[PDB]
Design a protein around this ligand. Structure first.
Ligand SMILES: [Mg+2]
Ligand SMILES: [Mg+2]
Ligand SMILES: [Mg+2]
Ligand SMILES: [Mg+2]
Ligand SMILES: [Mg+2]
Ligand SMILES: [Mg+2]
Ligand SMILES: [Mg+2]
Ligand SMILES: [Mg+2]
Ligand SMILES: [Mg+2]
Ligand SMILES: [Mg+2]
Ligand SMILES: [Mg+2]
Lengths: 141, 57, 185, 126
RNA sequence: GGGUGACGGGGAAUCAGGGUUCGAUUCCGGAGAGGGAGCCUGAGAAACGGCUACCACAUCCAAGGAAGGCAGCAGGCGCGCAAAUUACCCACUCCCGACCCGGGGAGGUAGUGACGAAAAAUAACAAUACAGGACUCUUUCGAGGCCCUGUAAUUGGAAUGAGUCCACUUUAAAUCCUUUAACGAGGAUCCAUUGGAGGGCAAGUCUGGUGCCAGCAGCCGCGGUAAUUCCAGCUCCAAUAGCGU
C-alpha cells in the first residue's frame, strides 16, 4: 500500500508527481498539445474573417440544419466552423466580415446537436449579434 | 447537404404584436416590500393542496 | 509609484446554493421586518456576524488564561456591548456564538428611528434618514445602516435645520403658501 | 453676528515668528463663511489686524453647521513676506507672480542648449 | 542535458483541517536600454536622455559628408480578444545643485476609466372606495374598532434629492465633494436592467404562431399540427445599477 514512513517525503512526493500525469485535466494544462491545437492560442475570443456560410446537419436524434460560418482567424491563419446562434441570425453575417468568435461553453468539447463545433459567433462587424437580433443597433452601410 | 434557405423562417412569419402599456413598476426596496407583502401578510389563507404563484386553470 | 491606498474589501459573501427556497424565504422575511433595500444588505450583516463568530471560535480554541485570548475576547465583547447587541453580565465569549442576524439588524438607524416613535413605519423611517431629517447626537446622519451605539441611542431625534425638527418648511409647503397668497388671495 | 468662532490647538511659533492654530467655525444656517470675514473676526479677537492673519484649508462638515481649518497670525507683514508661501500671499494680492507658464520656459531653455556664448542670442531665443 | 505561457521575494486568489493555483504589475533585490562588443570620465558606470565599432533598422546631403535610439511622460503606427490626455503645476512628498532663492513628465493635480471595492435614490404618509383576517359581538347573516395588508382615485397635500444654478469653501489655479441661497415630482412623468419560467433550479400544464422546419438546449432534452422547452403576447421568478456570455 502506502509508503507512509517518516523519511519518505521524497518517495511520496515523486510518486504523486508521476501519477498526476494520468489525471487527464492536469496533462491537458501542462503539456503544450492543447495550446498548440487551440485555434484561439490560449484566448477567450478571436476575430476572424468569414469565408463561407455553411450548414451543419444536426446529430442523429435531432434533425435540423444548423447554419454555421466558416471563419479564418486573424492571429493564427487557422480555420473554424463557428455556430451563428439565434433565429435568422445567419442573414446578418455577410461574407468577408470581421466576426468575433468565442468558445461554446465547453472548453474544446463540442455541444449538443452540432458535430465539430467548438465556437460561436459573438459580434459581426464590430456590432454584437445579440444587438442585431433584438433590433437595437443596425449593420452599417 | 441541406440548404441555408429557411434561415429565419419562424422569426419571419410570426404574428407581430404590440407590447402593451401598463405602469412604471416599483423598483428597489419598494419592489421588495411589495413582494414581501404578497407572500407573508395579505393572503396567508386556509390551504387547499399547495399554492401556485403563476397558477392558471 | 504613487500615494494611494489599494486597501479594500468586500463587505459580503454570496450564498453557494443560490435557490435554497427556505433560504430565499428567510432572507425575504428579513427584508420585510427591517425595510431593507436589497438582498446584499442582508448578506453584509450575515458576513459581519460570521467574522465575529469566527473570532469567537478562534479564541475558544486557545487555552483559558492565555493573554492573547483574554485581551482580544474582552475587546470583542466590549465592542459588541457598545453597539447594544450583547448584555453586560452576559460578557463571556461563549455567548457570542449564540447570537443572530436579527440582533444586528435591530441596532441600525432605520430601526432606532422607527423604534423611538419618530418615523411611522420602517419604510418611512428609511426615507427620513435618507432625506436628512434625522440627526444622531449633532450630525445629520444621512445613512440608514449607521449602527447606533447603545451609548448614543437616546440622542436620536429630528435634524434641527428641517421641517419636522422645527425649522424652515420644505419647498412644497412654500409653493402652496405662495399659491394661496398671490394666486387665490 | 450669529456665526461664533473658536481657536483650537493654539501654538506660539517663536521660531517661524507666528501664532498658529486650528480655526473651528460654527455657522449654522449659512453658506460657509468666506475667509475675509474669518480674518476680521480673528483680528478683533486677537487684537492684531487682518493684515498679518493668513487662513486656509477650510473644510465644512456634513450637515453644515461647522467648518474647520488652519490659520496663523504673524507679528508683522515684514515677517509674513519671508516665512510664508507665495500663493498664500497672492491669495490676497501682496506678492504676485509672473505669467510665463512653465511649458514656454522649457521650450525656451531647450533652445539655448543649441547656441553658445552669444548673450544677445541667448537673451533673444523666444 | 532539455523545457518553462519562468525575473526572485514580500505577497494575491481560493479555501474546514490539509492543500491547489498565481505572483509582468506601485516595497525590496536583480537584469536591460533595437542587437552584440569595447571604453572615457569619475568615489561610483563596462552608463546608454555618455562615447567607439559592427549588425539590423532607418533621416537630411549641394552626394564631399553629417547626424540617430520612448522597456521616461504624453502621443502615433503596428500587433492584437486585450489597455487613458501630445492636459495644469513645482503648492505637498522627496531629490539634485555652489543653493532659504534655480530645476525636476520623480511627484502631485485634473481628464478618460462599469478593472475592481464601499456607501446608496427610483418613493413615504394619510383618510377614502373597498378586499381580507387575529380580537370584541353574533346561532349564522351582520356590526365596534385598539390591530391591520392588497388594489384603485392621485383623492389629499406634506417630504425630498437627481437636475438647473448665484455665492462661499476647496485649490498652486481650478474642478469634485461639502456648505448654501433661488428655481426644481403627479408619475402620460425624473420610465431599471439583465437573464430566466420541463428537470437539475426560483418561476405558467395561459393564449397566438411554426410543425423533426425554423429554432432552443452547458447536461438530460423539446420540436414530425393540442410545443409547460421553439418565435411572440400576457403573467411570474432571480439578482438589481447591475446582470449575462
Ligand atoms: Mg520561454
Ligand atoms: Mg523593481
Ligand atoms: Mg546597465
Ligand atoms: Mg523599441
Ligand atoms: Mg551600454
Ligand atoms: Mg530615451
Ligand atoms: Mg479594458
Ligand atoms: Mg510620472
Ligand atoms: Mg459596486
Ligand atoms: Mg428611474
Ligand atoms: Mg432550469
Amino acid at each position: 500500500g502506502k509508503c507512509r514512513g517518516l523519511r519518505t517525503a521524497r518517495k511520496l512526493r515523486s510518486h504523486r508527481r508521476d501519477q498526476k500525469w494520468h489525471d487527464k485535466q492536469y496533462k491537458k494544462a501542462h503539456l503544450g498539445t492543447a495550446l498548440k491545437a487551440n485555434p484561439f492560442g490560449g484566448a477567450s475570443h478571436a476575430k476572424g474573417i468569414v469565408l463561407e456560410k455553411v450548414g451543419v446537419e444536426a446529430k442523429q436524434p435531432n434533425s435540423a440544419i444548423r447554419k454555421c460560418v466558416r471563419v479564418q482567424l486573424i492571429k493564427n491563419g487557422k480555420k473554424i466552423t463557428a455556430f451563428v446562434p439565434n433565429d435568422g441570425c445567419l442573414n446578418f453575417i455577410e461574407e468577408n466580415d470581421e466576426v468575433l468568435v468565442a468558445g461554446f461553453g465547453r472548453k474544446g468539447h463540442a455541444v449538443g446537436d452540432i458535430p465539430g463545433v467548438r465556437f460561436k459567433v459573438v459580434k459581426v462587424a464590430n456590432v454584437s449579434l445579440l444587438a442585431l437580433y433584438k433590433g437595437k443597433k443596425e449593420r452599417p452601410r | 447537404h441541406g440548404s441555408l434557405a429557411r434561415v429565419g423562417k419562424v422569426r419571419g412569419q410570426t404574428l407581430k404584436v404590440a407590447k402593451q402599456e401598463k405602469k412604471k413598476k416599483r423598483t428597489g426596496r419598494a419592489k421588495r416590500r411589495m413582494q414581501y407583502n404578497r407572500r407573508f401578510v395579505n393572503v396567508v389563507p386556509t390551504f387547499g393542496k399547495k399554492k401556485g404563484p403563476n397558477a392558471n386553470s | 509609484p504613487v500615494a494611494r491606498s489599494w486597501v479594500c474589501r468586500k463587505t459580503y459573501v454570496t450564498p453557494r446554493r443560490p435557490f435554497e427556497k427556505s433560504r430565499l424565504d428567510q432572507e425575504l422575511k428579513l427584508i420585510g421586518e427591517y425595510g431593507l433595500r436589497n438582498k446584499r444588505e442582508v448578506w453584509r450583516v450575515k458576513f459581519t456576524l460570521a467574522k465575529i463568530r469566527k473570532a469567537a471560535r478562534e479564541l475558544l480554541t486557545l487555552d483559558e488564561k492565555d493573554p492573547r485570548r483574554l485581551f482580544e475576547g474582552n475587546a470583542l465583547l466590549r465592542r459588541l456591548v457598545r453597539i447594544g447587541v450583547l448584555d453586560e453580565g452576559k460578557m463571556k465569549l461563549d455567548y457570542i456564538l449564540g447570537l443572530k442576524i436579527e440582533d444586528f439588524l435591530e441596532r441600525r438607524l432605520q430601526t432606532q428611528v422607527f423604534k423611538l416613535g419618530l418615523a411611522k413605519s420602517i419604510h418611512h423611517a428609511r426615507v427620513l434618514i435618507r432625506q436628512r431629517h434625522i440627526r444622531v447626537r449633532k450630525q445629520v446622519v444621512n445613512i440608514p445602516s449607521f449602527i447606533v451605539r447603545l451609548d448614543s441611542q437616546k440622542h436620536i431625534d429630528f435634524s434641527l435645520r428641517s421641517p419636522y425638527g422645527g425649522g424652515r418648511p420644505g419647498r412644497v409647503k412654500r409653493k402652496n403658501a405662495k399659491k394661496g397668497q398671490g394666486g387665490a388671495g | 453676528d450669529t456665526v461664533t468662532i473658536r481657536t483650537r490647538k493654539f501654538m506660539t511659533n517663536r521660531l517661524l515668528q507666528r501664532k498658529q492654530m486650528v480655526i473651528d467655525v460654527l455657522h449654522p444656517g449659512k453658506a460657509t463663511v468666506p475667509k475675509t470675514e474669518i480674518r476680521e473676526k480673528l483680528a478683533k479677537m486677537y487684537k492684531t489686524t487682518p493684515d498679518v492673519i493668513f487662513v486656509f484649508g477650510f473644510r465644512t462638515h456634513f450637515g453644515g453647521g461647522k467648518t474647520t481649518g488652519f490659520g496663523m497670525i504673524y507679528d508683522s507683514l515684514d515677517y509674513a513676506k519671508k516665512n510664508e508661501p507665495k500663493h498664500r500671499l497672492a491669495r490676497h494680492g501682496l506678492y504676485e507672480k509672473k505669467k510665463t507658464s512653465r511649458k514656454q520656459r522649457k521650450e525656451r531653455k531647450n533652445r539655448m542648449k543649441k547656441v553658445r556664448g552669444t548673450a544677445k542670442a541667448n537673451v533673444g531665443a523666444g
